[PDB]
């Protein structure tokens, strides 16, 4: 895709439109969460804290999910850095995208009115081949990740761990209103 170039008045500085939005403390997570896309989010979160540790960071999420470890690098960076990270759901926040959406600062988690938010237990974090001893190890690690995700989700949503274990058993699709009632987001934006 051709990323448009915009001019900032200050003299003039030419930005691509995403660098221009980063200047306004807007970080985009678009598409699958990979090592490379997650590290760009981490790099932007670290950079924005240095620019101003007090001003809010706006984390715009339009993602179907992705790697758990990649999403956890974003998650720990969001919680570590001093400035509040507000999260906004555009289009969809599914799987780790919904996790990072609920991971925003409490009171500053938003969704657009027709966005779709989906929460579910993790799938394969990696293949389970080799010997039965190797498969047992990877199954145990996946169960630990499953419990860790449900526990952190329950903390984000102010719900019991038993509620998240029921609701993440299979793909749980929610409207913005249902996610607000659930505890994934705080407000729904209209205008």
């Amino acid at each position: 895709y051709l990323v448009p170039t915009v001019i900032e008045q200050s003299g003039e500085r030419a930005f691509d439109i995403y660098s221009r939005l980063l200047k306004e403390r807007i970080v985009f997570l678009v598409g699958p969460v990979t090592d490379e896309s997650a590290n760009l989010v981490v790099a932007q979160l670290l950079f924005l804290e240095s620019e101003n540790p007090d001003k809010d960071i706006f984390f715009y999420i339009n993602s179907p999910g992705g790697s758990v470890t990649a999403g956890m690098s974003i998650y720990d960076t969001m919680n570590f850095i001093k400035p509040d990270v507000s999260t906004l759901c555009l289009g969809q926040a599914a799987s780790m995208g919904a996790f990072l959406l609920s991971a925003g600062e409490k009171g500053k988690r938003f969704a657009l009115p027709n966005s779709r938010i989906m929460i579910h237990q993790p799938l394969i974090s990696g293949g389970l081949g080799g010997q039965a001893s190797d498969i047992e190890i990877h199954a145990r690690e996946l169960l630990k990740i499953k419990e860790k995700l449900n526990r952190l989700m329950a903390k984000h949503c102010d719900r019991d761990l038993a509620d998240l274990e029921r609701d993440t058993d299979r793909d749980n699709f929610m409207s913005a209103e249902e996610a607000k009632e659930y505890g994934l987001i705080d407000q729904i934006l209209e205008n």
Binding site: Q9, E24, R25, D56, F110, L189
Partner: protein, 321 residues
Amino acid sequence: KLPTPAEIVANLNDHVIGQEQAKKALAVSVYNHYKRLRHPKAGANVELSKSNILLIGPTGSGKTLLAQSLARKLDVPFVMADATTLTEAGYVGEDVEQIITKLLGKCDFDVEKAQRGIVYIDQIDKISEGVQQALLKLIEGTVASVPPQGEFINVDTTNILFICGGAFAGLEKVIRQRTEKGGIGFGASVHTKLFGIVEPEDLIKFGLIPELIGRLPVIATLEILDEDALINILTEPKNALVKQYQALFGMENVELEFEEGALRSIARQAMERKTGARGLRSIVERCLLDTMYRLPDLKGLKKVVVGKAVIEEGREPELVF
């Protein structure tokens, strides 16, 4: 004697309407300036320095009128300069002290009066560097020489009060870049109060050299004239446009009158041009040209009533005989 900061605002309210914060700021700075000029300037006393003013406000807000009203009040000479009339290349020096020739000519070339005068510099923001450096060297104490009134004359500008002003258009966004959360975000501040909290880093980011900010310690802001103040301006001031044209009709036997809706509509038309009270004169003259040409021909006329339809539509003022 010398007018107190309260009496200055009292007399200055008759000519300017609104901008009370800038009015008191100018009054204090000017009173302190002309009290410093009364100090025992000799011996083991403290050498007193002046405090200049930076008037930030929209076009037509009354900055030049404020400076000229202060000058008329304090009997001092006054000349308005324009930073736009100073070129980057060339002898920026030779034409920056030509303003001194202008100020001297306004006071019979008596240096005793010009050295304690006032100078307003227009479009201080439109030079956002050689012009800035010359205005800085001149705002600070310097002895300049100009041709005679007909041998050269000397003028030391240390005791001259400088009131720079201009419509800093893009300054509010420079301020919002640090005062608000974000500009382009979904929920992030999408769009004179912020002019009131302006800090030196904003003016420097705007492109004003820091040494010029250092010699302009007083920053006063002027608010945009609303549709209400533009009506008072038409009626209340000592030199109101209604008063001028009523005198024009009054030297003859015809009494000019305006409808309140006419004043409100003509004030809204002036506000729609982004020029403030500057455009009021053109639209009033356009509206009254309907009769100023016919009135010579009309006989038996006693009064003319200017309705809102004359200002808004192609209507003629009602002629009652």
